[PDB]
Ligand binder design. Sequence first.
Ligand SMILES: C[C@H](NC(=O)[C@H](CCCC[NH3+])NC(=O)C(F)(F)F)C(=O)Nc1ccc(C(F)(F)F)cc1
Length: 240
Amino acid sequence: VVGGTEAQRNSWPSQISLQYRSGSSWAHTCGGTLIRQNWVMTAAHCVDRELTFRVVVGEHNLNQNNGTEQYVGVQKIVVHPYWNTDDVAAGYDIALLRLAQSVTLNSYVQLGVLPRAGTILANNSPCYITGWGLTRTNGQLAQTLQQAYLPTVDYAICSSSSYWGSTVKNSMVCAGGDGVRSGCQGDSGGPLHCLVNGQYAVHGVTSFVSRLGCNVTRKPTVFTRVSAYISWINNVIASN
Ligand SMILES: C[C@H](NC(=O)[C@H](CCCC[NH3+])NC(=O)C(F)(F)F)C(=O)Nc1ccc(C(F)(F)F)cc1
């Protein structure tokens, strides 16, 4: 996350780190949200390359044992039938991963709360972007989980020629754009947590940023709106 602060260990306990086996060890590639003891939600452009992946639930510092982490394998990857690699602007950036084993829930590992299908947020709704993503444009990954206050930008404003234009679809949530704070490479797939009904629900799956950089004035971070995929999410968990 660009322009972020460190989070406290118990802060966002449905946050996961998607890592791939990079020879001898494992490296962080993306975030995700734990949605079943055995299921994760991430972005489709993260699992595009056929690598060996692992999920780390209950992570905080990437580089240090925190004595709270659960390392689980991915036994099946389910990416949306319409994802097209080459067109992240089309939407459908969402994948579901069935984990090799069911995680143990505690104060550090908990399930992410999903919205009600069809829910659209008012402009400037309070949301937070979480992740291990670069802290500057062409920067390096954070060692600790970062959080940034990224309030939404509604779809009339975000598809303004001034902003992203027609690059953003109504199946996407836009948040930030102040040129200070944003999501960055390595945050992709991760949650956008918005306060609704005194509850934090994961309303985005971080999708992309501006090619000119991560924190650009009038370029907010774009998220896959979760509430548009509720009935696909359910149907996949149900048939597995
Ligand atoms: C450097 C930047 N990377 C990204 O935004 C990638 C998504 C990659 C899809 C490409 N296979 N994701 C992220 O970095 C995330 F952190 F922001 F979520 C970029 O490529 N973004 C980008 C690409 C295309 C368009 C579009 F085609 F829509 F015009 C918009 C943004």
